Design an enzyme around this catalytic site. Structure first.
Site, short mmCIF file in Angstrom:
data_model
loop_
_atom_site.label_atom_id
_atom_site.label_comp_id
_atom_site.label_asym_id
_atom_site.label_seq_id
_atom_site.Cartn_x
_atom_site.Cartn_y
_atom_site.Cartn_z
N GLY E 68 0.79 -1.21 0.00
CA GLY E 68 0.00 0.00 0.00
C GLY E 68 0.82 1.26 0.00
O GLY E 68 1.99 1.24 -0.34
N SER E 97 5.59 -5.86 1.29
CA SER E 97 5.89 -4.46 1.12
C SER E 97 5.65 -3.69 2.37
O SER E 97 6.22 -3.99 3.41
CB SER E 97 5.04 -3.92 0.03
N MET E 98 4.74 -2.74 2.33
CA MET E 98 4.46 -1.97 3.53
C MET E 98 3.88 -2.86 4.60
O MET E 98 3.98 -2.56 5.78
CB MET E 98 3.52 -0.82 3.23
N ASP E 171 12.68 -7.70 -5.39
CA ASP E 171 11.75 -8.34 -4.48
C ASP E 171 12.36 -9.53 -3.79
O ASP E 171 12.83 -10.46 -4.43
CB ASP E 171 10.59 -8.87 -5.29
#
Lengths: 192, 192, 192, 192, 192, 192, 192, 192, 192, 192
Positions: E68, E97-98, E171
């Site tokens: 996000g 991620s976040m 990633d």
């Protein structure tokens, strides 16, 4: 709050209704937007309800609308004539086309209109696609409807039928004082 | 929680109210966003409901909106003129076009605007497509409306009519202090 | 407030309901819009409910609709014939196509329409895409339906079957007095 | 359950609240998303309410927003200046554009921010299409607005006016410690 | 019931709750779906509410999310660090991620993850269109953010800063046992 | 070969033309489809080209068109009147609206239409959007155009001007014999 | 043949051209439709060609156009003034906006329009979106253009500059006789 | 090579044109696709060309088309009747609606169709939208056309007028032997 | 003929060229519209051709364009500098952005613009989306280009680099006399 | 070069054709893609041409097509049967549906298909929307077509009619050897 709530004291008290249900209780009905089939049906349900609540008291109908479907508008017209109590119609904002028609259908002597309002009358619109045979079938029906609408205008306004026939050729705009002179409303409200 | 709830003590409560119904109870009505046909009827219903409870008490109408349909916020004008109380129209954000038309219509001596607000006034817009004959009819009606709106501005602001006509040919923007000098409002609120 | 609330008093009071639930209580059902499956199913649920409430009292059905799907409409038709109490159908606005069919299906002697209403009747529409073999199957089914619909019209109206067949070849429009003479309705309501 | 419920006990108890109303009660108001017209209108109503419940206590305003419409943002600003209690603004997430101008508008000495937050400031945007004459009118108005916003920034931050104009030529991003040094906020909250 | 109701047993009775309010009472907050401002604004309100309820008890945050907006995620991060009680984070489904960033931000010793979960981490994304001068300004800001996020990762995980910088270039996917060895979480839950 | 080639002998015998070029050579010009600027611009070039080749011989114009833009059509009208040789117009298929106007503009005594053709004539259409001031300017111009078109009809047909005004308010259709009686054309062709 | 071929005799007689190259040979250029860059680029090439063919003879420019882009049009204007031979401009159909500007720029004494044509003039249009700084830059440039266009009108027409400014505030329509009196054209052509 | 070239020898032998021009030379014209204005306009040009080439020889028209616009189709009809040589029509594939009409319009004794072809005939279609007044005008015109088309069918086929009217109420399909018996064609071609 | 043909006399005189080919023979190249790759690639081919035809004579480039892609434009820039003969550039209409860059790149003493032209210059635009790492790479490249373009402007115009650096921050518009003074062109052409 | 040119020597040798025109000279016609009216129309023109050039020589038709419109395809069928010389059909790729029908229609003893081809047959498809009466008419027509196509298959293949009907109810695929046994083709070509 798209629509605010109000509170009223009676016996037990409190009793908080909607901003529109509070007015229905005051025998007030508003007619706005386009006149269609789903909305017109609600106007009728409200009139039947009020008629059964007290057959001897007037119903006030506030009109502010650009026009609509003739059929939907006629179901409103006929209910307004069938029910026992008078319906007093008040024109604020505008009453155009079918809206103007319903405005003049109110009880005689009780047709009011605010001073900066506008009323507009015109001929009925329609159309069709199909075989030449079907085109003639549909064309005759629209013409019969036009004739019927003119007769009801003459009945409610006091104008001769031919005068109505001429005044509906093209869009005709009338200011509140002209609505009174012409015969669409009986009077103009001013101040409390 | 698009709109929060509030509580207040009266008699044997409690009793929660909408963040907006709580203020309707304080005779405060908000007019925000573009003037349409559905929103205008709701404002009218609130004013009548406020004129039914106590007719000897002022009604505040905060106004923050960029304009709208002329003939549908020209029915919030006629309900303010007509009711018994005084509607003291405070200003904030912007009052443009028809919004600036209603702001000046409040009770004389009670028109207020916040210091960083903006008021803009201008000539009304419209249009039409059709036969040359129909174009003429519609052009005449818009011109009649323009003339009437100018008369009401001159009436409420104290400007001569010719001054009003010159000043609305193209958009004119006024700061809160200019609104006061021009006469659109009586004063500017600052601090409590 | 698309649909307003109403209040009624019985024993202890309270028990507020919507404008349509209040009328269902008075054994009044409204049928508007297009006839389709989800709506037709609700009309049926209401009729089954009212039968259970009181098998000896009439149910009033208001009919204002342009037409619709025959299958959905037939479920309404069969329920009306199956249940015990009479269903009295009243036409306002329009009853076209399938709407007209259901109108004449009400209890004999109790089919009424308002004076400015319109009724329109025609042979069924349909269509299909596929192999020549499938086209034949589907064409046969629509023709069987046309035949059955005509038999029911003749049964309910008193017209001969041949007269019904001729009259549905092309859209046929009937005014309220014509519907009475033809035999679609028994009478025209005027005033309470 | 987009928004959860919470309960609390006082006297009678219960008091089931939507979590945001539970915090309005604690004189906490949130400002998130774009600074539009409807949302700003709701914030103003909340501040007036709190200032009427207890004029002597501070009202916390939590800010997390990307920017928005200046006109709407200004009514929030004027209300904060008008009402009696101090408004303390805290900013967690971001305060950009109009979201940063209101962040500095809080009571002096009570302009705390987040440790990982970001504040961004810039020159106002706008545009127009039309005749060369109309373009001039609108160009003048946006320039007047730019000038006014620069004056208020200088007033609240302590920067000279010339320094404010240079710094808003292009977007300027400040970290929480820089916001403190620049004068946009008074301090950084860390741990309770 | 999109969301089911449950019933509890207190001093009084009834006390009906949503399939989520009931768990808020147990100091359980869920973070699911993509992180953005409105959702990130609601979680903060819940954490502040629980600290006040009882400053001496842990808060459990259940994380299942793809990532996000960083700004929104940072307001959650700062609140978690500011408030007094420990916030224990549990990773089920995914934390990417976040999401992964917030997962590691929980109280040391209390970072758990279920056996088949996945954690993925990477450098931040962004972009810009405009004049070469504006491009430079925005490019610098994203780089500052990247640097800050790397410092916080190293702080919470125990990895050196250089190691974090190398690992997040592309990633990186970690299984639950690797998240433990890497240091993103402290342990894996298995069976009660 | 959307358009076929034809072979003709002169001197050496080698000439191969597009069939339309072959007919231009025989002083035949076709006008078909909507009248617009690019199409009209080409017809004028063809007439000037033929006028130069032999100022003493007639040009035959074949008309089959629904109408079009008045301005574009007027450039055809003026060229026909300006150039020296007679232009004889022949209507095949239809000549409606602007097409009808150009049909009657042919040399007197030489306007001819085929037996099953149709000619239509109506007042001009148009429209505008904008400020009330601009609407007035544009409305005045369309009315001036209408007046000019009526004078030209009366001039070419021999009808009185008032008769022309009455006959164009609503679409008026004429069969080939009706066009002759009215004066739009001089005669009907039958067989070679 | 979207565009027909024509045959002309020289020596051998082996000449077949398009419906436009044949006229270019007669020093005739047509300008129709919107004015934009590619179209304008072609007109300029044609004038340079003709100038080289015979510096002592006039070039005829036929104009029929609604307007267009000023920049593109100015490249035609400057070429007409630069090249040695006179350019005689002829208005048919319409010359609006930039079209009128180019019409009046023809050689003095040689500016002619057909009897039923129309000429219309107005101030330039434009617009922009951006930061307040950019808006100012772009607003200044359009105003400079307005100024320059007015000077050129006054120079070519003989009107005072102030008269030109007043007359271009709003769309001004001129009939062919009005264009002669005003000074946009020198005369009206009638018959060959 | 959408359309191939063919070679023929005459004198010098240098003849190479598109196969469709090769057939125009043999007085064969093809009509395919929908009948509309541009295509019809081209057929008329071809027939006029061939008449001029040799007024005494037959022209063969190959018809294979689904129908089309009546107005366009009538210009083909009138040209065939006007010119001197007989036009012999041959139907292959289908001749429906307007195509069938043109097929029967060929020279008596020379209308021929291939063995597996189909011919269809039905009343004309159309439609309109507008005021009840305009609908009437347009409905009358379509009915006049229907009447005229029936007169021409009866004239060319030898059927009584009443028989033609009955037969076009709904689409009537005729096989090649049926077209011969009915009188639409004179005979069926079999083998060379 | 979208583009007309012209005829020239030489030896045999059997020459017909499209007007643009005819001007290429006069060593004239036009550059119009947006500067992209396919178009730029043709401008280069034309210059190489002319250089080969006669290395000792000038080439004239007519420029009228709203900028375009830098990369594409730089292939014109380098070709002009590589080839032996001088390239003289002439600005008409406009030379904006990359168009202005190419304008000033012509041979010294031979850069000329027409009197009503406009020249506009500004820093390069661009953009990108991706990982923070990629954003940095792309940001650096656009900045290097900005720097290089600034050096070439200073070289060709004679302005200091710092002055060029300040003047391209925001769109800068120059009138023809301003371009001469600034140093973008050497002079203004007036009349032949 | 969508279609390459080929050069062939004769007398003088000045012969250059499209490869498809070169093959038309070798009495070879290709039928590919969907069968529709325009493409079928072209094949018929080619067969008529070849019949005229030499009535005694065979025409070769190459078929590779998925199917198409029956009406259009029948016009090819009838021409093949009408013209004097034999038409030999060769299947390559596929011959499905209408393509298979035309394949078997070639001269007996001359129907040949390549070894990896596929032939597929099925009953005709179609459809309709409208009144039940119109549906009946169209259903009858498609069934008549189905019957006729089966008779022609039986005639050309030698199968009994009942066998043909059974085999086409659903798509039936045949490999080249299966087409030979069934009787759709006479033989399989292998090598030159």
């Amino acid at each position: 709050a798209l629509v605010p709530m109000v509170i009223e004291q009676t016996s037990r008290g409190e009793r908080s209704f909607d901003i529109y249900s509070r007015l229905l209780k005051e025998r007030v009905i508003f007619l706005t937007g386009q006149v269609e089939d789903h909305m017109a049906n609600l106007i009728v349900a409200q009139m039947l309800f009020l008629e059964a609540e007290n057959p001897e008291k007037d119903i006030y109908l506030y009109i502010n609308s650009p026009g609509g479907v003739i059929t939907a508008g006629m179901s409103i017209y006929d209910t307004m004539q069938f029910i026992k109590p008078d319906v007093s119609t008040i024109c604020m904002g505008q009453a155009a086309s079918m809206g103007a028609f319903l405005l003049t259908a109110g009880a005689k002597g009780k047709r009011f209109c605010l001073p900066n309002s506008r009323v507009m009358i015109h001929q009925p619109l329609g159309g069709y696609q199909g075989q030449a045979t079907d085109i003639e079938i549909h064309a005759r029906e629209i013409l019969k409807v036009k004739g019927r609408m003119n007769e009801l205008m003459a009945l409610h306004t006091g104008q001769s039928l031919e005068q109505i026939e001429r005044d509906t050729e093209r869009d005709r705009f009338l200011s509140a004082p002209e609505a009174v002179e012409y015969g669409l409303v009986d009077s103009i409200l001013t101040h409390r």
